[PDB]
Design a binder for this molecule. Sequence first.
Ligand SMILES: C[C@]12CCC(=O)C[C@@H]1CC[C@@H]1[C@@H]2CC[C@]2(C)[C@@H](O)CC[C@@H]12
Ligand SMILES: Cc1cc2ccccc2[nH]1
Ligand SMILES: Cc1cc2ccccc2[nH]1
Length: 248
Amino acid sequence: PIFLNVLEAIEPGVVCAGHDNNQPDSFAALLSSLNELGERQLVHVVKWAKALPGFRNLHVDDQMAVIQYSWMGLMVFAMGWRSFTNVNSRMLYFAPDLVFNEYRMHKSRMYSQCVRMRHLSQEFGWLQITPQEFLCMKALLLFSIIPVDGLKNQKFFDELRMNYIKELDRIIACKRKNPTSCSRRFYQLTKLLDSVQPIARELHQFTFDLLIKSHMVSVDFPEMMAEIISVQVPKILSGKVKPIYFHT
Ligand SMILES: C[C@]12CCC(=O)C[C@@H]1CC[C@@H]1[C@@H]2CC[C@]2(C)[C@@H](O)CC[C@@H]12
Ligand SMILES: Cc1cc2ccccc2[nH]1
Ligand SMILES: Cc1cc2ccccc2[nH]1
């Protein structure tokens, strides 16, 4: 399982948010911590992506593009997984020092979005998702959103996406027997993958509005976060860049 060896081998390690928990919760502090966590996580996601099989085939501008458009979903999907494995989806485990309970979900002023994310975490349990299926689905998420106008070199991207989908089928096919199970399983995983986009979309809208009024609510946005959310995210919210869905 060469391909699986790579995903397993390059999977990012634990990342902390640097949150002061001995300090009373507040909107400004929580969101500022989540943002810092984004900056820190982005760094790992970039190093992770550049190490994926065939990623370097993509044109350099397209490499940065898919990462800049997919980080939200990637991060949310991995966050859901940690929440499932660490606390069986009891809370949102953003980081070791940033675990969201119902109080924080509410205090973050993004309770509805958090509920959305916890529900995704629950799915990992309800579908009995394997660590390997998780890994393969996550890799596939990096290639699940592109500009309606296409990429610099769409042809390579298309080839790459086709291969990662082919790998997901392999994972499903192995350790299995019933051809009806393979198809059903693929149906469920693609359904799950699609369910990530609406959550990402809601978060994009939220962080965008947050960046705009950040100065008023006293929320901090690190360099890369401020740049990406003001330059790349708007392209998604305006319909110029959209998710690739399996199902209609
Ligand atoms: C991606 C992060 C940080 C990494 C993670 O574990 C998922 C989580 C989802 C909510 C995001 C947060 C980064 C900072 C954002 C974008 C805030 O501005 C509003 C929504 C937050
Ligand atoms: C490839 C790449 C993507 C990206 C996003 C934010 C900052 C730097 C980056 N390099
Ligand atoms: C996942 C993946 C398999 C593979 C084989 C050849 C070239 C690129 C590839 N990506």
